[PDB]
Symmetry: D2
Subunit: 450 residues, 4 copies
């Protein structure tokens, strides 16, 4: 019951991303239930969930379609592997559905996992094996971007573009390099986004040339950087990435764990930039968070390498016990059907557009707002101590937490990443939900002048 | 489409990268599409029924069709499908499961749980915890990991780097620096001795000497399975793990017990390490922790480890690890129900007893059939190792036909047993009975009779 | 047994063995002043200065006699536990004297630039372990940097030519944009280029987390990278950055050390005091192999900590402090100081660069001319508007080089760049001779 | 002379030492050498059992080498082997080395300046070789416990003792060290033939575990020097050659000490009847008169570069002073001395005599746990108790007491922890042996244990 849960909250847990010392006195809310876009804690406090779980409950809470798919599959066959000798029906169905839905990008095969970190890990392993199959085993290095976030296994962590995720676990993998990215609001080059895109592309090219292209396997990048603070690159940037990868003969890995299946207002973030990656990483929203599932998709160029007469090198020696878990796959199938039938990519585009417009008005109103960024239903409000210098609030400062808490205490679940308020609701959000959130945020800023 | 047999058959493997396999092989040799499971049996799309000696993949420990787990899952999914343990929030099944796991592993001294989704995550988490632990304790040079020949620790770059068989490693090199593997006490294939106690002591001394060579001040942890699973069901001598604990105490490195297979009963004790009377510093759990019904893993730590975060160490004491689906309320609901099943039906004891019986019956098979070079087991993990000649122990290769013939003769007579190279692997649900044992042994015997060597 | 065995039993440095079957190198037999003579009596002005190293010229009785006298007295004894030797002690004091402006108080000896760099890298790592920050293990360096050939130095190089055949190299070595005005994607303003490259360096350090970074290593003027002189503001910014992020500044002075760039040290030429300095090549005028890695008081004092085994310096080669090498270096350093060759390099190099700019005006193939003191390069391009370089396979640069060699001037190429690094005793008359021959080479090979 | 004493250690980073120790315990300033004797600045004369540092193999004051050096420096002090040029002493020395190492199949030399350079060169050569042969995954190096392979990052990563490694971590990925057949200290057996076979099988299984397709080479010393003069069983190195052949990895012989005679054969590998793929030489190659190293390769390795492989066939290695004409002139004179005076045979005979005398000493004094030697490479290992083989630690006084008694009675012998190391010039005589043995005997008598 409630008292037991409150007593035991955090005591036997290593909570992600937190210092356990802070949790002795500052206990997290015990979220008890969800319906639609709202969540309710054990004490009955109700919120609009602007976190959307954690960028993943894209279809909303309480979807009977997914619950029923999960129950029926688990009643019939709770588990069987895709390891030598067997497969299962939901995994087959989901594999075909994914090659269908990502046909535009040229995806022809799926490798399943359980979350975004393993989707990324799978992608990195695939790239290395691909080049060994292609008779270029020196191609082993990975390039990624400043502010990129690619998950927490040693591979993805080595590919991350912020040291916060890396420093305590060093030394990380050799051969991982990060380069300047087109973050307009904080860059040393220019206030022109097209010039910024081009200078960042050329920096990337010159680092690749420095490494020797014959030693580089792939570039990995998010179409829109999520955990790095919702950084939307200039539209010319990703086409340049595709050109650079073609030029130096390295793979383009699109980390679509957040942008996959609609959030940024296109069915894929790459598609939103009109770019076809070689490899795509999907997780989070692909199952609406109801059951863990990830998928790494590859194109024919990549897949055909395993059709070489290469002996043991053509054995795909990867894949997790729960790869293709039939309950995961059932959930993912129902969620993708919802995404398509209700055109949540378009709803994200429109409601996200409206949301972004209202935030821009809010920015003019409240001096602590240094920057507002968004595409579809991924948005961030960046708070600064001084607009002229763009000096950020530190993790230690109180103001971001004050704004967050004023929202939370008035029924709007918005949390921070350092100095940035992050907005990533379910893709079923309405303009009315937007107006509610904007009203509460406005009141929060009014009550906390800067 | 998930109910359309001819569709399933025509799209089987076409759009998928199957684990551990050459896609060239799958155009003509199509895997069985398993459609349903009940108890210890599974049924394919064509209605063929099998005793599932794979136990899914060492993980359906409670059996198929368990209403307890199904209902727990449904009810939790109706209430709250998901919410994170990230700054600001938690959920009730995650709190409950964290407390349950520390209770069940009280004997080993486990006080905190870090959740993930599968064994590879559990291992990666253990490795990250060890490195951060030693930075917290003011010894940041302690970064190296030692593991064992034939060890399997999953497939992310960390775990893969810790594996003791190159099959999982070579296509993805170069792997992580600072991972070293040493001689392990594999009685059937070792260059030292036919005496198991002498083998344990020599392997212990070899380990010590490699640690000393690395300099202990650069080594963070030893990782090892209480009984090696994918390496081919290799049961160490009883003295080995107590020596491992002693070696770790002597050199001041952490002992990580990879219990992804042995955790929660399969080897005939609730934990493999407990089976050896050893308390690890960190325990990796997955697979059977949820009976395979929903992906879940847990990495447990003792007080010694957890308290390193209880210091003013600035940003070094922020645990910057944890997966989006860490603590998934549905996964945790499933794991709570499976653990209640394991405890209430004493599946650790059933694994112990029925496994002892299974191993005895396997020795009869070894007596009759020349190709069986070795039979191994503890609790309900067993292997039958096939060799071309017993005097030399020359193994069948992955390319050879005999192991596969024995397997197919079983599958075609209602017994799902597959191979890892030259070894037939047996890891059924822990609810297996002695009568199930005899059914499988009769089928296996007939397979060997039909395939003389 | 010389022309018949030339290259036959040899793995020649920096070369494709396929090329050596087709055309064999000149067997150089003798040297005098700034001239060299081959086995057939062909005489050349040596614009290579051996290999950036015969800084005092050939045939210096001062150095030859120092060497003979020492080898007659004591050919060798080590600096290992229990022993030392006199020339090593003397050279130690001389180096701390000469580099007093930079704050250098200790030297670790070696045999060449690669070991000097390896020594600096090991010192930096051990320093941070002594200072209680063992996570500080990564190294940052510059595009076009050249830091020798052992695995550390090779890892630190900023050109892939030295790297790709030996991969995978050391983890934790990162290279960043450097201010090469002639070829950069940012600006043609050198002050703006210096500042943008400094900010790029800062942001890469921050990306790595400064607590994982040990040191920056850089050449005051980049040599093998093609004689790239940075803007004057750049190195003060490097010192500022290293102070801000608490990483060591390693100055690779293997070429610029002891006068070639027109200051006794390149870092001095920029008014910057490094934490660690690498010296080789010209330190002994190439007469006997010798290198020295110097450290300041900040670095040295870390070993005075009660740190147990961490404070044992487990580095140093058999021939560290070789008495003959040290005697040769003492004589060469005396010559550098006695004849003020740093000032001569400054003045005659200024003159050389002026003459080269006139040549640039005259001949379309010269895209850029660069120099500081007596390190100069003429960079040849297929079209100046695009700066398209000649490739290693192209004939024109080798044609110019061969016309010089066939007219008594030893100038070789680094790809599309003619490199000039003569002895520091070079005169304006030597300059005019070389310039006339170069001019006729261009006239005879019109572009 | 007074200035030498005042500035001793003051401006210097002394190898292998804590600088705090050097403020008060100053090293002896060695001033001159003749024959096998050295003299310090105070006129104290010593028999140099260090042979400089395993390197003054022809003795001190050799007119042949001094004159070769002087005349060469008089003619041409330096010119490079870099694109466009070469020099005569370099050509001559390459041919001489290919002739002297003909038995081993050595056909090409890449020159350097010291043993660390020779090892680094071997490692780079191996990696580039396998890339040329179309197997670029072959990058890992296996070496032996107690192996010493110099101090650059590659060689340091290959070392088999952590003392050289821990202060500079993290070292290179892909370097692995295995059990070696050190009879005196091993967990397996007191039978050397059995020890050789078990260590060979441990090496095989580690290679197999790594996957042979990822391993470039094994590097090992025919007799381990800095690790404490560890002589392997005679069967071991033939097994090493068999293993390298079986798994298709290169065998690198680190002959920096054993090269050119010290162990009683012209090469240690020859002493074991084994032909390596790559050989590392330094130290004695020039009798220590001028810094020089050479890395030799056989036809198997060399032919890889004769391929149309584009840039991969460019040897982008070689130091400024590779093939330094003065160094090469010195080495040619030193090799001439080694051959004409058959110093390999003298090392064999006088070393066997030396080892016999040391065994008598072991019978005499309980502090001696073990005596080891081949040719003029010998060690006396001191232990606090023979039954347990408990060593003296670096902190203990007894080994230093024995060493100081020898030094104070005219015999220059130093320690590596608990081991007295003996490596005199290869011109050592039986008379010299008896001189040293008398002094050592009295040192032990004066310091009973
Ligand atoms: C862009 C991106 N990459 C990788 C990951 C890793 O996913 P997970 O947190 O499920 O391991 C996430 C989340 C993500 O948003
Ligand atoms: C011992 C062991 N460790 C780790 C793993 C990795 O688990 P998963 O296959 O769920 O990634 C497995 C399987 C295993 O048996
Ligand atoms: C800056 C620098 N460092 C190091 C070296 C290494 O010199 P060497 O080739 O003599 O080892 C050189 C040449 C150099 O120019
Ligand atoms: C002494 C030694 C080295 C070190 O060589 P340096 O000349 O000191 O660089 C390397 N390898 C072996 C086998 C040695 O004996």
């Amino acid at each position: 019951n409630k008292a037991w849960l409150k007593e035991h909250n955090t005591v036997h847990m290593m909570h992600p991303m937190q210092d356990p010392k802070a949790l002795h006195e500052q206990r997290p809310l015990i979220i008890q239930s969800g319906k639609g876009v709202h969540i309710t804690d054990v004490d009955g406090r109700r919120f609009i969930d602007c976190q959307g779980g954690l960028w993943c409950v894209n279809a909303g809470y309480g979807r009977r379609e997914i619950i029923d798919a999960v129950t029926r599959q688990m009643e019939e066959l709770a588990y069987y592997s895709l390891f030598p000798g067997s497969t299962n029906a939901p995994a087959i169905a989901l594999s075909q559905k994914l090659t269908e839905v990502a046909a535009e990008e040229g995806m022809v095969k799926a490798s399943f996992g359980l979350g975004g970190s393993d989707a990324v890990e799978t992608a990195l392993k695939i790239a290395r094996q691909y080049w060994k199959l292609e008779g270029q085993p020196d191609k082993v290095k990975f390039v990624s971007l400043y502010n990129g976030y690619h998950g927490l296994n040693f591979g993805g962590m080595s590919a991350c573009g912020g040291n916060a995720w890396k420093s305590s676990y060093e030394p990380l993998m050799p051969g991982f390099f990060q380069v300047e990215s087109p973050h307009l609001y904080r860059n040393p080059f220019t206030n022109d986004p097209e010039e910024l895109a081009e200078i960042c592309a050329q920096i990337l090219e010159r680092q690749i040339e420095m490494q020797a292209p014959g030693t580089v396997a792939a570039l990995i990048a998010e179409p829109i950087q999520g955990a790095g603070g919702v950084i939307v690159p200039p539209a010319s940037y990703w086409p340049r990435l595709r050109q650079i990868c073609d030029k130096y003969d390295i793979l383009l890995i699109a980390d679509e764990v957040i942008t996959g299946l609609g959030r940024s207002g296109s069915l894929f973030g790459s598609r939103g930039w009109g770019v076809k990656p070689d490899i795509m990483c999907l997780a989070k929203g692909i199952s609406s968070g109801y059951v863990p599932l990830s998928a790494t998709l590859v194109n024919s160029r990549v897949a055909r390498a395993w059709e070489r007469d290469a002996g043991f090198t053509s054995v795909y020696m990867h894949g997790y016990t729960y790869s293709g878990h039939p309950v995961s796959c059932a959930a993912a199938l129902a969620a993708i059907d919802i995404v398509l039938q209700e055109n949540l990519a378009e709803n994200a585009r429109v409601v996200g557009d409206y949301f972004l417009e209202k935030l821009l008005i809010l920015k003019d109103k409240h001096r602590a707002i240094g920057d507002v960024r968004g595409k579809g239903l991924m948005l961030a409000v960046e708070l600064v101590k001084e607009r002229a210098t763009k000096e950020p609030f530190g993790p230690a400062d109180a103001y971001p937490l004050a704004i967050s808490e004023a929202c939370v205490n008035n029924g709007v679940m918005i949390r921070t990443i350092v100095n940035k308020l992050i907005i990533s609701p379910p893709l079923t959000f309405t303009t009315e939900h937007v107006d509610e959130v904007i009203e509460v945020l406005d009141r929060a800023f009014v009550a906390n002048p800067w």
